[PDB]
Amino acid sequence: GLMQFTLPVRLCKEIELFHFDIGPFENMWPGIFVYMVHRSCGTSCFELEKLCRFIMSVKKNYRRVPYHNWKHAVTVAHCMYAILQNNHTLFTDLERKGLLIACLCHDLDHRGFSNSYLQKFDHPLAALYSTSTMEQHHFSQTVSILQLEGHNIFSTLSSSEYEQVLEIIRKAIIATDLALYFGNRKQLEEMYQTGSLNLNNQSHRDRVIGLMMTACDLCSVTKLWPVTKLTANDIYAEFWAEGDEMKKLGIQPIPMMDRDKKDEVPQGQLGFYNAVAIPCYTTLTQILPPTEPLLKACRDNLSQWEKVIRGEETATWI
């Protein structure tokens, strides 16, 4: 009850910053998460013993893939921590509880393959869930772990608070399907500019939490350049394996996924920053001004990719 998590000084200070990298010591990531829950939520939010058991079953259900792994889960949860700590008074008690858990669980049992690949493969999950295929699976795995004996971290909530928090987690996890992000951001753009955006309107809060989930999910493009560049390598290791799997189904993959087209990566990163990431952090920053550092860091990384194209610097891995 009086048992705080404390980090070394460098981490205690840098964990507050948006561009924090959780480091290469896997055994420290659970304590980093619990530190963030304790400071974001309270030391009373969860029973420590149940939270620790929950965290360790979540870790076990992330696979050893290059990018959609346990390190990504914790990284996405940290970006949510930093957004919540910079916007203290905007979010409900149930939202603080739900959203860190949503981020930790948002890619549970990811196999390193896109929704597209599962549908072309004719995977059974593509018959069970016709849209947002992996994201419905991630939510389903979250509910499974929550129902394991001793894993119910929400056990002290009323029946209606429990339904509400699981509904926050379901929408937050579904929102990480980037297919849904484009229309969500367009609507948030119109709402903000015509001045109809209303944080008391539940359907408005839902849209804003969705955009927060996209922002946290993509946050590897908001790190210092050496982190972003080395993380780009991991996500392309997945993209290229999926492309290989498309060639095995007799389908030419898109270039992003074609390892014979490594030369096209710098230009593909430009399209990704201009079409997805910069617009995401731009609209986030309009709704939640204290999240501006994410936009600034994203613009810094677009500028490094522009330098890569002008040959003023390299990748190696390209």
Ligand X SMILES: O=C(Nc1nc(CN2CCCCC2)cs1)c1nc(C2CC2)cnc1Nc1cncnc1
Residue among 19, 38, 68, 110 flagged as catalytic: 68
Closest distance of CB 24 from ligand X, Å: 16
Closest distance of CB 171 from Mg ion, Å: 14
- Considering the complex, state which of residue 107 and residue 242 has its C-beta at the smaller distance from Mg ion: 107
Which of positions 196-225 make contact with ligand X (CB under 6 A)?
218, 220-221
Alpha helix locations (H) across 86-154?
93-105, 115-121, 124-128, 133-146
Residue 103 binds ligand X, judged by CB under 6 A: no
Residue 135 binds Zn ion, judged by CB under 5 A: no
Closest distance of CB 235 from ligand X, Å: 4
Q: Which residues bind Mg ion (CB under 5 A)?
A: 107, 176
Residue 271 binds ligand X, judged by CB under 6 A: yes
Which of positions 55-114 make contact with Zn ion (CB under 5 A)?
107
x/- map, 213-232, Zn ion, by CB under 5 A: ----x---------------
Which of positions 167-196 make contact with ligand X (CB under 6 A)?
178
Q: What is the DSSP string of the chain?
A: --------HHHHHHTTSTT----S-GGGHHHHHHHHHHHHT-SSSS-HHHHHHHHHHHHHTS---SSSSHHHHHHHHHHHHHHHHTTGGGS-HHHHHHHHHHHHHTTTT--S--HHHHHHHT-HHHHH-SSSHHHHHHHHHHHHHHTSTT--TTTTS-HHHHHHHHHHHHHHHHHT-HHHHHHHHHHHHHHHHTT---TTSHHHHHHHHHHHHHHHHTGGGGS-HHHHHHHHHHHHHHHHHHHHHHHHTT-PPPGGG-GGGGGGHHHHHHHHIIIIIHHHHHHHHHHSGGGHHHHHHHHHHHHHHHHHHTTSS--S--
Annotated binding-site residue numbers? 68, 72, 106-107, 217, 269
- Considering the complex, state which of residue 219 and residue 297 has its C-beta at the smaller distance from Zn ion: 219
Annotated binding-site residue numbers for 3',5'-cyclic AMP? 68, 269
- Considering the complex, state which of residue 73 and residue 287 has its C-beta at the smaller distance from Zn ion: 73
Does the active-site annotation cover 123?
no
- Considering the complex, state which of residue 150 and residue 226 has its C-beta at the smaller distance from ligand X: 226
- Considering the complex, state which of residue 178 and residue 278 has its C-beta at the smaller distance from ligand X: 178
Q: What DSSP designation does 313 have?
A: S
Residue 234 binds Zn ion, judged by CB under 5 A: no
CB atoms within 10 A of CB 165: 22
Residue 275 binds ligand X, judged by CB under 6 A: yes
Judged by beta carbon distances under 5 to 8 A according to partner kind, the member of Mg ion, ligand X, Zn ion, none in contact with residue 270 is none
Cβ burial, residue 48 (10 Å; 0-12/13-18/19+): middle
Judged by beta carbon distances under 5 to 8 A according to partner kind, the member of Zn ion, Mg ion, ligand X, none in contact with residue 235 is ligand X
Give contact residues for Zn ion (rule: CB under 5 A): 107, 217
Give contact residues for ligand X (rule: CB under 6 A): 178, 218, 220-221, 228, 231-232, 235, 256, 268, 271-272, 275-276
Residues known to be catalytic: 68
